[PDB]
Design a binder for this molecule. Structure first.
Ligand SMILES: COc1ncc(-c2ccc3nccc(-c4ccnnc4)c3c2)cc1NS(=O)(=O)c1ccc(F)cc1F
Ligand SMILES: COc1ncc(-c2ccc3nccc(-c4ccnnc4)c3c2)cc1NS(=O)(=O)c1ccc(F)cc1F
Lengths: 828, 828
């Protein structure tokens, strides 16, 4: 067709990559996946509710936090409904539905929409179970909604559309040669399966030149029939010993066919590390410069007790109780496997049990499938996200194992998927094949809910624009989502990408030119030209918010070396309750993906703290990676850095407390800010400690006028003191040197409650941390790196040792005063 | 009948107890056993060869020892056949049969009989495989046989002849009271099974008087259906804590009936010890004085894999490799039981595996029987006597387990049964029931071979006359044997018992009267009266030898406090090659049973040494226990004590070497005596060390004129230096203080070869030692007692540490010289 052309081109433009381009594939897997994904797409689209999809209510089934209760006077919540010019304040009960609310208003068709936002309070859900309502309560804000007409669902219209088990020969592969357009070397051939090296063979070392031939058959010890679905041929080049290049080939393809024939693979260049890029089946796109290797190489079929000696059960339980990062000895595996049927009665033994499987033996793999067939304890088990995540990491290449993980994820409510979306999108990198159950799950949940969909779009598009290793795979999944999300979101994404693309250019043109008066007249000039750009666009980190017109006079070039744009937008929603502008930092030169991850962990940390009636007042500002080393960041209102305050490398102790009094008009407020400070401070001390990012210079720590403390720029320290608890912070709590005070004792108490809380989720955090390092920090992918968090969470320790451990830390910060901040200033 | 009367009375007179007397039984088990034993008796009698039974060839299938080879010149052995007055020396080949020999003699009906002995060289056996022939060779004696006529087999004529598994109630027993014709006390009720206490209940303590009543029901935790065949109700009385009396009752009888009703049991008096008397089901016969207990109390039915984790197989093998006296932890048992089918592939795991059985659970016991049903590795296994003995000790009460032990014993040749007869007879004490497979086995093997039979008679009769705990059981078995052994042996036993009974009296009458001239005229007088006594009788420790007339002039009263008779007899066989008299010590006042055991171990030690081409020249003189604290001992010819030599408490170093020169007429002989001394010395050092009986006073060590050293009186030290290696012994080897010599180096070498040899039979010796202490040393029955031999045999050590261990010992003896012998003299 012709309209399909100017539509596939639109898709490409949103995606940022051409899913038709076949200049870099050695098979048809990507294409097959495009087709395969049609069914799940159409299934979800066809069975989605029109009205609920249009309005996308943001709700939760969780209980209302205790601290959120202590803010409700006599089971009454006031809801101010605005019609056109007027407004009526109403008594509502937390337990009643919006439907009810409306009928109790007509006494003194339509649907309640949050004022100045694309957020609807609608559906058969208690007003208390709406996130927006919980947000207002938390901040002590007033709940304002307008009486508008339901969005026309027609705007969400979707456009019209020999057996392997018989070959007993040893596997072998011929290494022809290696070529590079521009020391001795050898090629190493590994047959891997989920980080496990099944078998390995090397070549003879040969003088390294622009072309090295071998023409040798490498015969492995593994029989062709013992090859597992998902096994990689891992080709690596060493020089003399150090790894220079690598590349991977799936030995069994997406149709269960053994791999056969001639291959010239373009390899990746290197910069025992656990980097997820090392696993990719994709070949390097840069054919011109890249090193390449030449190799020369039946379908896989499908599958269809004495009481334990007490001491063995003790040993088994001991093992199952260890942490995810706890290494299994061959003795442990032999035991887990020998007693596999007992192990299966424990959902928590699963990650370790399937790590005890000899995937290199077709008979063992078969018995394993027989295990998963007696899947009743697992299927009936209460969803455990940390446990489910462990089955989705780099240590599992089997699609049935990984599939029972995704199966458990289906019970997640939209609110929880949002909590784990980013890390789930990242976990797609550990999938052997492009079309996996995990991928389909992401796709289905994005199509079912606009909010998840919106972030799915930016998480994918973020990876596609800066990950050559995985962009092809991600681009296909993004396409499947764009073809089912609907006409209105398409138009919205189109608008958002256009705006960002325009703001990118300006950022680049301003950069190539400290902050002079000329560079300022050029920022203002370029902005004036652009504004003369969509009349409105959604904010990617806060999609309910629509930004509109620029406030050029408030725009500027910040004073860092990266010359970030500080932008200010008017809210395009007239029904907005304020004139406060939307503040967006636009930054080029950094890979903001790592920040997104840290911030997202912080959000997960807060929910853990909520399940324990705790609110450490963190501030995970919005941060979205939009392209190659560019992105945008939420400007937190009324905020100033701790360094700028002191600046008013000398440091004063009272200066901070002074600054709060100044900004608090009354005493009730100063005291409430001094509380906020104590909570937000403890929140960031505990958080940063766990994530090993506490030792920051105070230039990187900020504070709101209402006393809310919060760290910033988490990529900088990922690119001694356990955390920043400096005198000025302590002074606010009212303490000097060897002393104590009503707040300091409070602060000490919140920490230990925060700390011990997190430790109740050791495994979930260990897995999330491990995965964060393998998919976002190609630099921080060492064994000793990952195992930092085990120490920081005092694994194995009881709550007394742990408590006394953290307190010792808090002391280290005091005994060291300004010593570390002072060094941090010294410019050597 | 009437002839049966004067024949049952004869049996009683041989037995030394009336198997008809029912004045001491609470059931009919003994009687039932008398009847039960008829079949095995008649089976063996009916199927025994007349001629071979009459002549009882003493043969062996073992190879001729290497040292026995080096005594055969050019495959020729000379055999001097005597007819009447003449004699012909003949060339014979070691490999040819006696049948052959005869045909090679008529050239230059009948049967060859050793001169002056009831010993025949007959049958289809190589002349080399006759023990007599091996004896002559060993001693360098000349083989003299006479051509006599075959013994008439007619002389061997034999005279003409609710279910338990349904009762689910807890077992209980009522303790009425305790009575004694002549502090507080209580009764303790144990349900035991093979030294294992299944369940235990006590009474309330009550003031100890001549009659104490309780009238209380003791309810145990064990269900009636879980009671194992062979379980004992073990009633014990404690005073305040110390055990005073005990008695046992089989809870399930010989017909598989549960025990029911009223019992008054007469209990045994005491003198955590492992005494075999404590296990007896017999009641005390001394009704007049003995303490007794009153108690008040359905038939037992009959019965009809993932590879091991390497580490578990390692652990299992580790366990199975330990020694018999090595204690199993509950962890070990749980493992052996969990992996019972693997354990069954190892005959050596058997003792430990059946010690890992919960006999107190009818379901476990049942599975165990299912194990023994897959008895193929065991049944095909090469006979291991030590292993078979472990299944017959105090730790096994189950008749099926114990029965597979006796089954393995059937493959023993007569020569080997003789080696183990004594300890097998003792092991009958560990049998729960009177009619056991072990008992039948003994009976069958005694009836099949006259020599075994002869010793069977004296071993039984020894126990019957000094063991009230087991005499009833033993007396029944003896009766079964006497009714099938034949008319000639009956007459012989009759003769032997008469002689001994006469010699006993004289010993008693002489005792009640140092050595005066009057007591001498009274010994001679009493002997003169007796001789005016069978004209001939067999020597119980050497049955082939027939003693006849006394040599009164050589008779005397030895100079010990026990006033033993030193007797001298003429050999009643005219065809004897000498005029040397038979020398027999007749001793009253000692329990000679312990000696018999030690000596018998020494004999077992020599056979072990033979299987390793070694001959340490021990001298296990004959010693038979004939009655209550009486017995007889072989006088070793041309022998004098080491003390009497020195006496010629001062000690001289050369005196011993001097004594040898004196007695050796030539130099060739002195040198051959100095060799004999070095071997016999090392033999006794190693032996005594292992049995913890080395530290003897030299009054208890003797030497033959041909240099053969040998210890005596082994009951004395069972009633510091590791062994007697005194200067005088070392001088003979040619050494003084810090020195060495051709012999000393030799002696050191033989020891280590002797020692390491025995260690190859650690288990066999440990079991034999353990059993020797539990059936013969009521005094030496402690845990630390039994486990002495583990240390002396350096269990677990390799042959280097062991070798260097023994050498250190040999040194201890030198560094201490006469120090210990000197103290041994000091009369404090
Ligand atoms: C990705 O790294 C970042 N992470 C976070 C932020 C960030 C986020 C939210 C905010 N809300 C309010 C105010 C500010 C603000 C304004 C002016 N001065 N300071 C902070 C603010 C900054 C910026 C960056 N990048 S950055 O702007 O170059 C930069 C880097 C390091 C540094 F210490 C300072 C920086 F300004
Ligand atoms: C059961 O205890 C024994 N074990 C063994 C023998 C025994 C055995 C064989 C023999 N062959 C030849 C010569 C003698 C012999 C003659 C004279 N003097 N000494 C030994 C000899 C002794 C005796 C006893 N009992 S004993 O005769 O009372 C006795 C006890 C301790 C003691 F040192 C001395 C004793 F003479």
């Amino acid at each position: 067709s012709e309209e399909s052309q100017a539509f596939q081109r639109q898709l490409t433009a949103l995606i940022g990559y051409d899913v038709t381009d076949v200049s870099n594939v050695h098979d048809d897997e990507l294409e097959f996946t495009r087709r395969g994904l049609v069914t799940p797409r159409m299934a979800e689209v066809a069975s989605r509710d029109p009205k609920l999809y249009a309005m996308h209510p943001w709700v939760t089934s969780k209980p209302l936090p205790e601290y959120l209760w202590k803010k409700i006077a006599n089971n009454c919540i006031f809801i101010v409904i605005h019609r056109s010019t007027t407004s009526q304040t109403i008594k509502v009960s937390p337990d009643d539905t919006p439907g009810a609310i409306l009928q109790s208003f007509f006494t003194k068709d339509f649907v309640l929409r949050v004022c100045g936002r694309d957020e609807y309070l609608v559906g058969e859900t208690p007003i208390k179970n709406f996130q927006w309502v919980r947000h207002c309560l938390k901040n002590g804000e007033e709940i304002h909604v307008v009486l508008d007409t339901p969005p026309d669902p027609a705007l969400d219209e979707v456009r019209k559309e020999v057996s392997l088990w018989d070959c007993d020969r040893k596997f072998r592969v011929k290494i022809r040669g290696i070529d590079i357009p521009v020391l001795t070397v050898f090629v190493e051939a590994n047959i891997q399966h989920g980080q496990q090296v099944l078998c390995q063979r090397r070549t003879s070392p040969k003088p390294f030149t622009e072309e090295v031939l071998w023409n040798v058959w490498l015969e492995f010890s593994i029989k062709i029939k013992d090859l597992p679905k998902g096994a990689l041929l891992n080709l690596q080049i060493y020089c003399g010993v150090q790894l220079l290049y690598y590349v991977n080939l799936l030995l069994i393809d997406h149709r269960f066919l053994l791999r056969r024939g001639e291959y010239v693979l373009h390899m990746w260049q290197i910069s025992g590390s656990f980097n997820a890029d090392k696993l990719t089946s994709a070949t390097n796109p840069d054919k011109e410069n890249s090193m390449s290797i030449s190799i020369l190489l039946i379908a896989l079929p499908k599958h269809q007790r004495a009481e334990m000696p007490n001491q063995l059960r003790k040993q088994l339980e001991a093992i199952i109780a260890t942490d995810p990062l706890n290494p299994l000895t061959a003795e442990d595996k032999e035991l887990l496997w020998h007693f596999r049927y007992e192990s299966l009665k424990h959902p928590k033994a699963y990650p370790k049990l399937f790590s005890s499987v000899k995937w290199g033996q077709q008979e063992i793999v078969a018995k394993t499938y027989q295990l998963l067939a007696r899947r009743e304890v697992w299927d009936q088990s209460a969803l455990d996200v940390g446990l489910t995540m462990q089955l989705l990491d780099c240590n599992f290449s089997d699609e049935n194992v990984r599939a029972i993980a995704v199966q458990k994820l289906e019970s997640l409510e939209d609110d929880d998927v949002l909590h784990y979306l980013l890390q789930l999108v990242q976990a797609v990198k550990f999938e052997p094949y492009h079309d996996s159950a995990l991928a389909r799950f992401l796709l289905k949940r994005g199509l079912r809910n606009k909010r998840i969909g919106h972030f799915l779009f930016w998480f994918l598009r973020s990876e596609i624009a800066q990950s050559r290793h995985y962009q092809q795979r991600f681009a296909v999944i993004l396409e499947a989502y764009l073809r089912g999300c609907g006409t209105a979101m398409l138009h919205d994404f189109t608008q958002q990408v256009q705006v960002i693309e325009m703001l990118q250019k300006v950022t680049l043109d301003i950069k190539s030119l400290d902050v002079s008066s000329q560079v300022i007249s050029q920022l203002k000039q370029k902005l004036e030209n652009l504004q003369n750009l969509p009349e409105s666009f959604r904010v990617p980190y806060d999609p309910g918010l629509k930004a509109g017109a620029l406030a050029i006079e408030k725009c500027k070039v910040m004073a860092s070396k990266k010359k970030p744009l500080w932008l200010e937008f008017k809210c395009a929603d007239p029904t907005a309750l304020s004139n406060e502008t939307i503040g967006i930092i636009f930054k080029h030169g950094d890979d903001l993906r790592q920040d997104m991850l840290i911030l997202q962990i912080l959000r997960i940390m807060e929910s853990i703290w909520e399940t324990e009636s705790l609110d450490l007042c963190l501030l995970p500002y919005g941060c979205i990676s939009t392209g190659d080393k560019i992105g945008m960041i939420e400007i937190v209102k009324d905020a100033t850095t701790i360094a700028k305050i002191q600046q008013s490398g000398a440091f004063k102790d009272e200066v901070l407390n002074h600054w709060l009094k100044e900004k608090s008009p009354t005493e009730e407020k100063f005291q409430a800010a001094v509380e906020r400070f104590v909570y937000s401070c403890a929140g960031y001390c505990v958080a940063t400690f766990v994530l090993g990012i506490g030792d920051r210079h105070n230039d990187n720590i900020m504070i709101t006028e209402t006393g809310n403390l919060f760290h910033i720029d988490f990529g900088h320290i990922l690119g001694r003191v356990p955390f920043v608890l400096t005198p000025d912070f302590l002074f606010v709590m009212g303490t000097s040197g060897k002393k104590t005070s009503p707040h300091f004792q409070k602060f000490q108490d919140i920490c230990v409650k925060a700390y011990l809380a997190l430790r109740h989720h050791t495994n979930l955090l260990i897995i999330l941390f491990s995965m964060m390092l393998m998919t976002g920090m190609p630099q921080l992918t060492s064994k000793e790196d990952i195992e930092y968090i085990r120490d920081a969470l005092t694994v194995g320790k009881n709550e007394e040792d742990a408590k006394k451990y953290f307190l010792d830390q808090i002391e280290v910060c005091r005994d060291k005063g300004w010593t570390v901040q002072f060094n941090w200033f010294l410019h050597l």
